[PDB]
Design a protein around this ligand. Structure first.
Ligand SMILES: CC(=O)N[C@H]1[C@H](OC[C@H](O)CO)OC(C(=O)O)=C[C@@H]1O
Length: 351
């Protein structure tokens, strides 16, 4: 497999089990925040990591529970972090469900002004963000994984998500991805329009001039579903299967996507299991002509063996001068969450 700068297990089964990773890079801090669900999802835990380039290593600090990220009598899950470059405020969106076909799922948000050391009490955004549609869903979720902040005038916040809709009384709820939008730095929220039928966990990234929001979602088909928004996430008109991006047997697996400075304005990177018959062999895919579906490359092998959920983060310029990437993924039959750090040069030397 591909040689990288670092490969370290940052979460592993012990008194508890860990799943559903989310990674967040803090530019001016040369630091990363690794989030995960702590299952008996009971709570959300976090680990802070400081990146030292000279040693090509991130040093991770002790694991700590995000105390405020919970609603009394509910389980917290799907950590979705975001760093506001405008205010220097950290956001952590998550889902809260009763300790135990009516919708009882809640959308929550906690914030930190000291880079994740301490958090505010949670804000239940459910009613104001979803409105009437709430009763038309069996449940919903955000992410999991890092969110997006657009470089539009308002520096809008974009939270990838999906909802199980009760479209027909005799049919089971059908999932459709969409984005929650805020144009006032998280004070108020709006529900964006749904992308095609049968789309689940997704992530968004912004490319390029025309501003385009690309959405990459998990589907129940043999390939990923990709959608494009030309109006900052409100509408995802274009939508199609991406045959080159395979989805494993059961009902696919969650994957991650980010944008990053092109060596030549931006390219896309995507990670997801590459075996067509199982969740194994984490692969990295490059799209040098985003968001063109046929431009997705062949996958490069990042990790052999059992691999599931993942999350990416652009970490700036790497030691070899090329784009540096951080990746957090579930491995070994969910026995752990591994942190992988590598550059574009290491993974796609021909590009
Ligand atoms: C909120 C929640 O339970 N998330 C689940 C997610 O659910 C997908 C879909 O909703 C199923 O119908 O899938 C998986 C999974 O390993 O496949 C792990 C997450 O923890």
């Amino acid at each position: 497999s591909l040689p990288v700068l670092q490969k370290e297990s940052v979460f592993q089964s012990g008194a508890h089990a860990y799943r559903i990773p989310a990674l967040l890079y803090l530019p001016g801090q040369q630091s990363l925040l690794a989030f995960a669900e702590q299952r008996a999802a009971e709570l959300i835990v976090l680990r802070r990591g400081d990146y030292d380039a000279p040693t090509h290593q991130v040093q991770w600090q002790a694991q700590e529970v995000v105390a405020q990220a919970r609603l009394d009598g509910h389980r917290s899950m799907n950590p979705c972090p975001l760093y506001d470059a405008q205010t220097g405020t950290l956001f952590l969106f998550f889902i809260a469900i009763p300790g135990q076909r009516a919708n009882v799922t809640r959308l929550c948000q906690v914030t930190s002004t000291d880079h994740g050391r301490t958090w505010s009490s949670p804000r239940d955004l459910t009613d104001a963000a979803i409105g009437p549609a709430y009763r038309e869903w069996s449940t919903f979720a955000v992410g999991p994984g890092h969110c997006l902040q657009l470089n539009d005038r308002a520096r809008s916040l974009v939270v990838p998500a999906y909802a199980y809709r009760k479209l027909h009384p005799i049919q089971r709820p059908i999932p459709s991805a969409f984005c929650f939008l805020s144009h006032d730095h998280g004070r108020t929220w709006a529900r964006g329009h749904f992308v095609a039928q049968d789309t689940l966990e997704c992530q968004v990234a912004e490319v390029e001039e025309q501003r385009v929001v690309t959405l990459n979602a998990r589907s129940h088909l043999r390939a990923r579903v990709q959608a494009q928004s030309t109006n900052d996430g409100l509408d995802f008109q274009e939508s199609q299967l991406v045959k080159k991006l395979v989805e494993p047997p059961p009902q696919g697996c969650q994957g991650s996507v980010i944008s990053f400075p092109s060596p030549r304005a931006q390219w896309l990177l995507y990670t997801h299991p590459t075996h067509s018959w199982q969740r194994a062999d984490l692969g990295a895919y490059l799209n040098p002509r985003p968001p063109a579906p046929e431009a997705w490359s062949e996958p490069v092998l990042l990790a052999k063996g059992s691999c599931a959920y993942s999350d990416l983060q652009s970490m700036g310029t790497g030691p070899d001068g090329s784009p540096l990437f951080g990746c957090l993924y579930e491995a070994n039959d969910y026995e752990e969450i591994v942190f992988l750090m590598f550059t574009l040069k290491q993974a796609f030397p021909a590009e």
